[PDB]
């Protein structure tokens, strides 16, 4: 066969150890999910806006008593209600409180006041993967593989907790000071033992079964991994067009084209992740995640060493001081106004 006796026993043992880790990870998550005003605004100095979404914005802040820097996600409660994202917001906080994994951002504090909700998490200073990818053009296959392997492990972890992530893209991936990935946004993540049906995600990264309004499962995350690996290695995604509807037609078509510089191993991995047929998609078969981790394209990946953050990263972002923001774009600074009247108090009681 492909493995001799020594490699075969080593791999089996490694896979078993993953099971034991994940079982313990699940019991820790569930304990924390079942039993979670950890600070206040005056405890931080607001430095600079790091990013904005429909919710509000993310600001670099310095915790005054300790001098530590953090990223503070500020959500305007009235905007959240108008956007119909109450459940998404409470769910994101609950996930962030309960998970623990080296590539998942760590929530330090959370609190709320009359007008806003606050999530204070570790500041990830190296910038968005998106910027780095667009600047560099494309990542070499070893560089893309280093990032991919972190997503594989992160999804292996999240899926064992029955969490589907559903919004993988370079825009949602931050680079930390050691060059490793951090995932921060969980606004579309959901606990899904079986199927779910919500149309959500980002056009270029949608699995065909979402587009086709089917009940779908965690395998949509493995399709999105295919799209991510493709985009990292090519510099552009496999399916693009002027308008989303044309992107969708391409996704569901079963056709994908590859750059001529893609290795054969990469193309084979991608044909099996970007597989429209669920009965054949890697990550969705009897062998589970092992079909991906054991694939030839990942043969040089030492999965434990990636997890332990013992692999030297191919790229280490520019790092000056602890509150340096040079790896982030400039955003327009809007003041954080706090109404004298409580807004949407009932909707956010649990936050």
């Amino acid at each position: 066969g492909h493995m001799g006796n020594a490699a075969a026993a080593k791999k089996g043992s490694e896979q078993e150890s993953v099971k034991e880790f994940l079982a313990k990870a699940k019991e820790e998550f569930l304990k924390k999910w079942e039993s979670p005003n950890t600070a206040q605004l005056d405890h931080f100095d607001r430095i600079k806006t790091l990013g904005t979404g429909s919710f509000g914005r993310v600001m670099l802040v310095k915790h005054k008593e300790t001098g530590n820097h953090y990223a503070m996600k500020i959500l305007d409660k009235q905007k959240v209600v108008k956007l119909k994202q109450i459940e998404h917001t409470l769910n994101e906080k609950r996930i962030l409180q309960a998970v623990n994994f080296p590539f998942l951002v760590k929530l330090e504090f959370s609190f709320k006041d009359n007008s806003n909700l606050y999530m204070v998490m570790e500041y990830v200073p190296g910038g968005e993967m998106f910027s780095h990818l667009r600047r560099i053009g494309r990542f070499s296959e070893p560089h893309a593989r280093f990032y991919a392997a972190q997503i594989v492990l992160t999804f292996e972890y999240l899926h064992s907790l029955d969490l589907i992530y559903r919004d993988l893209k370079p825009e949602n991936l931050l680079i930390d000071q050691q060059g490793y990935i951090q995932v921060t946004d969980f606004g579309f993540a959901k606990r899904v033992k079986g199927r779910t049906w919500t149309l959500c995600g980002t056009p270029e990264y949608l699995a065909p079964e979402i587009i086709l309004s089917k009940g779908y499962n965690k395998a949509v995350d493995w399709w999105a991994l295919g799209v991510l690996i493709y985009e990292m290695a090519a510099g552009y995604p496999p399916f693009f067009a002027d308008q989303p509807i044309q992107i969708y037609e391409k996704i569901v078509s079963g056709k994908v084209r590859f750059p001529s510089h893609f290795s054969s191993d990469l193309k084979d991995l991608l044909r099996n992740l970007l597989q429209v047929d669920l009965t054949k998609r890697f990550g969705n078969l009897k062998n589970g995640v092992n079909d991906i981790k054991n694939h030839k394209w990942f043969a040089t990946t030492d999965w434990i060493a990636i997890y332990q953050r013992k692999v030297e990263a191919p790229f280490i972002p520019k790092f000056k001081g602890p509150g340096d923001t040079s790896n982030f774009d400039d955003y327009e600074e809007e003041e954080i106004r706090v109404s004298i009247n409580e807004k949407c108090g009932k909707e956010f009681t649990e936050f």
Binding site: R134, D167, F188, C200, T202, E204, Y236, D242, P244
Partner: peptide, 18 residues
């Protein structure tokens, strides 16, 4: 080229969720 086509799509910047 495919890259040129990507540029022509106009979806080269940060993409929003639906």
């Amino acid at each position: 080229t495919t890259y040129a086509d990507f540029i022509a799509s106009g979806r080269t910047g940060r993409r929003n969720a639906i």
